[PDB]
Design a protein around this ligand. Structure first.
Ligand code: HEM
Length: 153
């Protein structure tokens, strides 16, 4: 679905993310919870954290951000050939945490927001478009996996 040129733009900006996975993960999750407070209720250990400073000081939250971005990054690098990497994620969001595609859209929005805020020069129109297509592919394929497992989220 994505051309070679589009994948290169995606992997180019992702390399920037890998310069500080922890920091990007924190900003993305914090942005997620603020723009969509309902998503926070999915994390039990994450609500005695009332302020942005507390969320950033939380090593638990930081660890989770890296776990999330690391998994997404591995998938993006497969350039569409991610069935093997996607299967495990589908099981988690469909059998263990019940994460609807709508929430994946929310977090995709947070990802785009943080990428543009931290890397303007390397995340212009063409790059934003590519990332959007990559994340849409990801959400489409995981939704199909969700259904195979019996989850219509
Ligand atoms: C970019 C998409 C995402 C990726 C790649 C991802 C990846 C992961 C991975 C690798 C884990 C650890 C294994 C597991 O428990 O299944 C995890 C856990 C979890 N994720 Fe997902 N995730 C994503 C999006 C989301 C969203 C949007 C939510 C909710 C609003 C969410 C909520 C959770 C929760 C609650 C856990 C359990 C954590 C714990 O107690 O440490 N994730 N995720």
């Amino acid at each position: 679905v994505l051309s070679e040129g589009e994948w290169q733009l995606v992997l180019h900006v992702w390399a920037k993310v890998e310069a500080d996975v922890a920091g990007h993960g924190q900003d993305i999750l914090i942005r997620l919870f603020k723009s969509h407070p309902e998503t926070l209720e999915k994390f039990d250990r994450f609500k005695h954290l009332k302020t942005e400073a507390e969320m950033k000081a939380s090593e638990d939250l930081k660890k989770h951000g890296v776990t999330v971005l690391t998994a997404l990054g591995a998938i993006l690098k497969k350039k569409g050939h991610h069935e093997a990497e996607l299967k495990p994620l589908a099981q988690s969001g469909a059998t263990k945490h019940k994460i609807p595609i709508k929430y994946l859209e929310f977090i995709s929005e947070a990802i785009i927001h943080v990428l543009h805020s931290r890397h303007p020069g390397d995340f212009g129109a063409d790059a934003q478009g590519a990332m959007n297509k990559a994340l849409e592919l990801f959400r489409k394929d995981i939704a199909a996996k969700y259904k195979e497992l019996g989850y219509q989220g």
